[PDB]
Amino acid sequence: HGVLLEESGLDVQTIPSHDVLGRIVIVPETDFSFDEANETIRTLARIDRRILEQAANHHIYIQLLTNPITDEPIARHLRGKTPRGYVPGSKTWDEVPGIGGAHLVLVRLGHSEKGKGHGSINLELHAFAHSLDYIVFDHIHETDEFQALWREEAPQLFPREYFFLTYPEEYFAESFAYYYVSEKTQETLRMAAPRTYTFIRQLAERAS
């Protein structure tokens, strides 16, 4: 079922924006790892508060799981199916540790870093960025502005990576993760794709 972070026993007052994340994040009802949950929440806490507040206004939740995402009712229908953009026969949704784009983001604890069932630099930021794109910013990856940034700069940050060069919504979610994962990755984004950096930066102003 899950418990809201604000209703759990986890202490989070030193986590930035804990009041808004307390209403967004859902942690498991069953024994999980306090370190993995704390690192995932503090990473989400790097997001500008205006964006997090808009997510709460749109009733977006981020549920942290200790099991495959397809065990949850919301994603059960994806069992046995190839994820969008994946080569057939290389993966099913049951093996995917995170999913975003709707009002309930699912993120499996312990699979945040690259290679842990996925190829993102940060699973929770990538998955959450999908819901921000589709719900909070009304499919902003489809705007003419973002389409121009994607065609020009996606090859600069993800050269010869068909996944990001084919799906602009995927370029958005991973650029969002680069912006918020660390000072280093944000600088990488700023150096290789300065217009994309500026676009992600302006999201906090769009959310207010």
Binding site: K91, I99, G101
Partner: peptide, 7 residues
Amino acid sequence: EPLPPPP
């Protein structure tokens, strides 16, 4: 829409 992470 169900959106996955990169492969």
